Symmetry: D2
C-alpha cells in the first residue's frame, strides 16, 4: 500500500509488535510465529510491526528480516505490515529495499549504530533511507538518534513518504513541541517500554495511539485499556494500571533487556513456542517466569 | 489555615512563585517585593509561594525566609502564602517553625542539600520536618530527592498535614504511578521551571494544576493559556506555545540558571525593581534582555 | 597559619576526614569526637578536615561547625585543621568567618546548594567567599559545582589564598588539564569516595595526595597503602585493593549514602562512640555491620 | 599470528587506527588508503586496526570490511593488522570469520547494537564471537557494552584467544579493578577519544599502552608524546598537551562525531585524499578545517 494509506492505518487503532520466534538452536521458527500472529489477528490491531525491537530486530541478520516479514504477511490478513529497519545508511538502505520487495507496507527506522551524531548527519542518514524506497517511513527517536523539531520538519518537507514518528525518549517537553510544530503532517506513536504507563500523558501531548508490547500475550487486556483510554474512562485505566501494569513493571525492572524478555516469556506462558531470546538478552529465571504466570492469572489462554 | 484548607486552595487554580527582590548591594527589598506581589494577587492566583525556587530560595539565609513571607502576607489578600523550606533536616525544621510563626499557610519542602540519599533516609527527613509544624506540607520531587510512590504513600499515612506533591523531574512515568496510587489523598502540582510546556501531558497524568514562573511578568498571558487548557481549547494553547513559550525556551536554554534569571529579567522589564540575581546565577546580557523585551511586546506594561 | 603554610601541609602526607559523632538524641558529642580524633592523630596524617562531607557537613547546622572545629583543634596536636564550608554565597561567608575566628587553618568549600550554574556565576560565588577570609581555601569539584581550567585560573589570579583543589568528579580528562595548566600554583587532592581505588591513577594525573575516609577506622591499612603507593610498590597496593577495597566497595554500594554510613559503621566497630548518621543518610543494617566486621578482621582495634 | 603473538605485538608500542578513505561517492578508496597506511608504516606502530571506530566501522557494510583489511595488509609490512568487528552476535560472527579468512591477526569487538544488556548476555554474546575464530580477540568497554571485572574473568577462563581489553568509558575506578583482577592475563589498551589526554593516569592504572587517533595525521608528534610518557618526561608530555592536545580538544568538541571527523580532516590536510565521512557523521566546515590546519602548523607534511 502507499504512504498515505499506511499513515491512515497507523491512526486507526492499537499497534502491536510481535516477538520473533526462535527454535532451541536460535533460528527463526516460522511455523510458531505464524501461529502466534494468526492468534493476534483475531484481536484486530490495524498495524503489525514485524521485527521491531520487541521482535529483536537488533539481533537479526539482515537476510533474516525479509523472511520474518513474509511469514507475518501470510496470516496477517487485512493488517498493514511494517518492518523494522536500522543500522547505518548502507545496511539500512539494503534492508529497506529487501522488505519493500516482499511487500512490506512501510518501515520503522530504528537508530543508527554506536555513535552520537550531529543533527545535520541524522537528517542526511534518514533522508537517504527514505529516498531508497517508495513505501511509508516511520522515524524513531531514541538513544543515539533524537531528532529535534526543526530537523524533523526539514525531513518531512523533503520526504513525502515520511508519515510517522515513534517516540522512545520519554521527553514530554520535546514530543509536545514536535506535535505542535508538525500537526497532522505526521501520525504520532507512543513507543516507550510498556507504553500504557505513558498513554494518558501522551494523549495530552497529542499521541492517540502507541505500541503495546503486552498485547503479545494479553491482547484482550491491552484492547480494554486502549478503549478505556479513548473513551475517557479514567477509573478503568487506573484499575488496569494498578492491577496489571505496575506489577508487570516490577518484573520488567529486575534486569536489563526484560522489556523484551518478560514479553516473550509471556508469549511462551500463553502456550506459543516463541523460544529463547538471542544473546545478549537473557531469558527470565524460573522464579521470574512463575511471578509472571501468577500475574497473568485470570487472563491465561490455557490451563 | 489548616492543612486541608491549603490543600483546597492549592488545587483551585494557577499557581505562582514570585521572584525575590534585591537592592544593588544585595539585601532583600521589601517595598519593591510588596508592590510586585500585590500586582500579582490582582491577577487572582489562589496561592503564592514566597522564596521558592524561582524566588531563589537556594540563595537565601535561613533568617531571610520569614521576612519575605511576612512581606508577601502584608499584601497577598485572599491569596494564601506558602513558604519555601529546605536544606538538611536540622535547618529545615528551624526554617519551618520560623515561617509558621509569621503565619505561613504552608511549606514547600525543597530537596535536602548535596547528597544522594536512600528512600528510607528521605522518609526520615521529610517525616521529621512535617511533624515539627501544624500547617500543610507539599513535598517536591527533583534532583537528589525523588520519592518513590510507596515511600510517598508511607509518609501520607504517617503525616496527615502532608497534602501536596510538586514535580520537577519530568519523569512522566513515575508521576502517573504516584497519582494512580495516592489518588485524592494529595493535590498534584506541575513544577517544571517552564511548566506550560508540560501542562497538557501533566493533566493527562492526573495533575490537579501547575505553577507558572512566567506569570511573574506576563500574568495575563499565563492566565490565558491556563483557561484554554481547562476548557480544552487545544488550538489556543498551541498558538501561545508556538509564539511565546518555545521562543522563551530558546532564550532560557542559552545559559544555566536562566529558568530563574530570565523570569527575573522579565519582571524588571515590566517596571518592578526586582534587582539582580545573587551568585552563582547570572543575569541576562543586554542582548538577551532585548530578545525577551521583543518577545513580551504586546504584553508590555 | 598563613595560606602558603596550610598549602605546604596539605601536600606533605595523607589526609582524612573524621566522621562527626552525634549522641543518640542527635546532638554533637564532643567527648567522643576528641577521643576518636586523638587516636587518629597518632597515625600522623598532617592535615585534618573537620566537618567535611565524610563528617556530614551537609547535615550540620551552621552553628555546630565552629564548635566541631574547636573540638577538633584541642586534641589535634600540631596536625593542621581545615573546616568544611558551603551552601549559597551568603551562608558560606558566614560559615567561613565563624570558623576562622576559632583557629581554622583553612577551608574546604563544598558546592553551593541545589542549582546548576554558569561558570561566571561559580566564579563570582567562589571569589567573594575567598575574599571574606584570610586563611587558605581549597575548592571542591563535584556535582553542581565543576570548575573548568580557565575559570579556575582566573580565580587563582584574583585570590592568593586559594591554594588547594579537591576533585570529586572522577573526570580524568578535566583534572589532568587542570594540573597541566595550573602547575604548582595549586595542591591537588584526590577526593573520590574511597579514593584509594583512584590514587594510582591520580598520581599519574599529577595529584600530590588524596584523602582516605577509611583512615577513620583502619588507619593502619591507609598508611600501609599510601606508603606502598609512594615507594612504587604496586604489588602491595594491589593486594590491599583486592583484599580490602573492592570488598568494602561491594558493601558501600549496597545503598546510597553509604560512602559515609559504612565509614561511620567502621568507626563504631573499632569502638569509638560515633553513633548514628543524621537523616537523610541511614545506617547499615546489622547484617551489613556483620559484613563489615568480618572484613576489618585482623585490623580490628584491640584492647 | 596466533593469540599470544598478537598479545605481544599489542603490548610493544603505540597503536593506531587508520581512517577509512572514501571517494566522493562514498565508496571505499583503496589507492589512497594503502598510500596513507604505507606512510604510517614508516613510523613503526606495531599494530594497525583496520576498520575500527576511527575507521568508521559503524558505517561500513560487512562485506566491505574484508576488502579494507586486505588493502591495509598489502602495505603494512610486519605490522600486526587487527580488524574491527561488531553488532549483534550473528553479524559479528560472520565478520569475524570473513576477516580471519583474509588473514587478519586479530579482531577488536565493538559493542553490540542498540540495547542495554545484562552481564550474562554480554558474557554469552562475546563468548560466542570468540569461539567462532582462532585468532586473537580484543574486547572493548564502551557505551551499551561495559563488562564488569567478574564477567571478564569468566570470559578469560573460558576463551584463551581473548587476549586484550580496550577502554572507552574513562571509568578509572572500574579499569583499575579490571587490571588488578586479571593481571597479565590481558594486555590493556587505552581507548578514549584523544587518549593522550588520559595516557598518564591510565599507565598509573596499569594500562599496557594506548591508541592515538591523531597519529593518523601527526604521527611524529604522537610518537614523541609516547616516548616521553614511557621515559617519565612529564614536562615534555605537558608541553605537548598544552600546545597541541587541548587546542585539538577544543576543535573536536564543536560538534558530535568530530572525534572521527576532525582526525579525517587532519589526514586530508596532510595531503592524503581520505575523502568525506559517511552520514551520520558530518565533515568539518571550511572554517574549522582552517583552525585545524593552523594548529598542525610546524608539523605539516606538505605545502599546498
Ligand atoms: C518499539 C515498541 C516498544 C514497546 C515496548 O517496549 O513496550 C519497538 O519495539 O521497536
Ligand atoms: C518550583 C518550580 C515553580 C516554577 C514556577 O514558578 O511555576 C520552584 O520554583 O520552587
Ligand atoms: C578506538 C580508538 C579510539 C581513539 C580515539 O578516538 O582517539 C577505535 O576507533 O576503535
Ligand atoms: C571529601 C571526600 C572523601 C571521600 C572518600 O575518600 O571516601 C569530603 O568528604 O569532603
Amino acid at each position: 500500500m502507499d504512504p498515505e494509506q499506511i499513515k491512515t492505518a497507523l491512526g486507526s487503532g492499537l499497534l502491536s509488535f510481535p516477538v520473533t520466534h526462535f527454535d532451541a538452536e536460535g533460528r527463526f521458527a516460522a511455523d510458531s510465529y505464524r501461529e502466534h500472529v494468526e492468534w493476534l489477528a483475531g484481536y484486530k490491531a490495524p498495524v503489525l510491526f514485524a521485527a521491531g525491537g520487541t521482535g529483536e530486530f537488533f539481533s537479526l541478520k539482515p537476510d533474516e528480516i525479509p523472511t520474518i516479514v513474509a511469514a507475518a504477511k501470510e496470516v496477517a490478513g487485512e493488517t498493514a505490515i511494517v518492518s523494522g529497519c536500522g543500522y547505518g545508511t548502507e545496511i539500512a538502505v539494503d534492508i529497506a529495499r529487501s522488505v519493500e520487495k516482499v511487500g512490506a507496507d512501510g518501515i520503522l527506522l530504528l537508530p543508527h549504530y554506536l555513535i552520537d551524531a550531529p543533527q545535520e548527519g541524522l537528517y542526511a542518514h534518514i533522508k537517504k533511507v527514505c529516498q531508497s524506497v517508495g513505501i511509508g517511513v516511520m522515524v524513531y527517536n531514541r538513544d543515539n538518534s533524537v531528532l529535534q523539531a526543526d530537523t524533523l520538519a526539514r525531513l518531512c518537507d523533503e520526504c513525502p513518504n515520511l508519515v510517522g514518528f515513534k517516540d522512545g525518549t520519554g521527553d514530554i517537553g520535546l514530543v509536545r513541541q514536535i506535535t505542535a510544530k508538525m500537526g497532522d503532517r505526521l501520525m504520532y506513536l507512543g513507543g516507550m517500554p510498556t507504553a500504557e504507563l505513558f498513554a494518558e500523558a501522551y494523549l495530552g501531548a497529542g499521541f492517540t495511539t502507541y505500541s503495546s508490547a503486552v498485547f503479545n500475550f494479553v491482547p484482550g487486556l491491552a484492547n480494554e485499556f486502549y478503549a478505556a483510554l479513548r473513551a475517557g474512562e479514567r477509573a478503568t485505566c487506573e484499575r488496569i494500571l494498578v492491577d496489571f501494569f505496575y506489577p508487570f513493571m516490577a518484573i520488567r525492572n529486575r534486569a536489563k533487556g526484560y522489556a523484551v524478555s518478560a514479553v516473550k516469556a509471556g508469549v511462551r506462558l500463553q502456550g506459543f513456542n516463541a523460544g529463547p531470546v538471542r544473546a545478549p538478552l537473557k531469558d527470565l529465571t524460573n522464579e521470574e517466569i512463575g511471578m509472571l504466570e501468577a500475574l497473568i492469572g485470570t487472563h491465561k489462554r490455557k490451563a
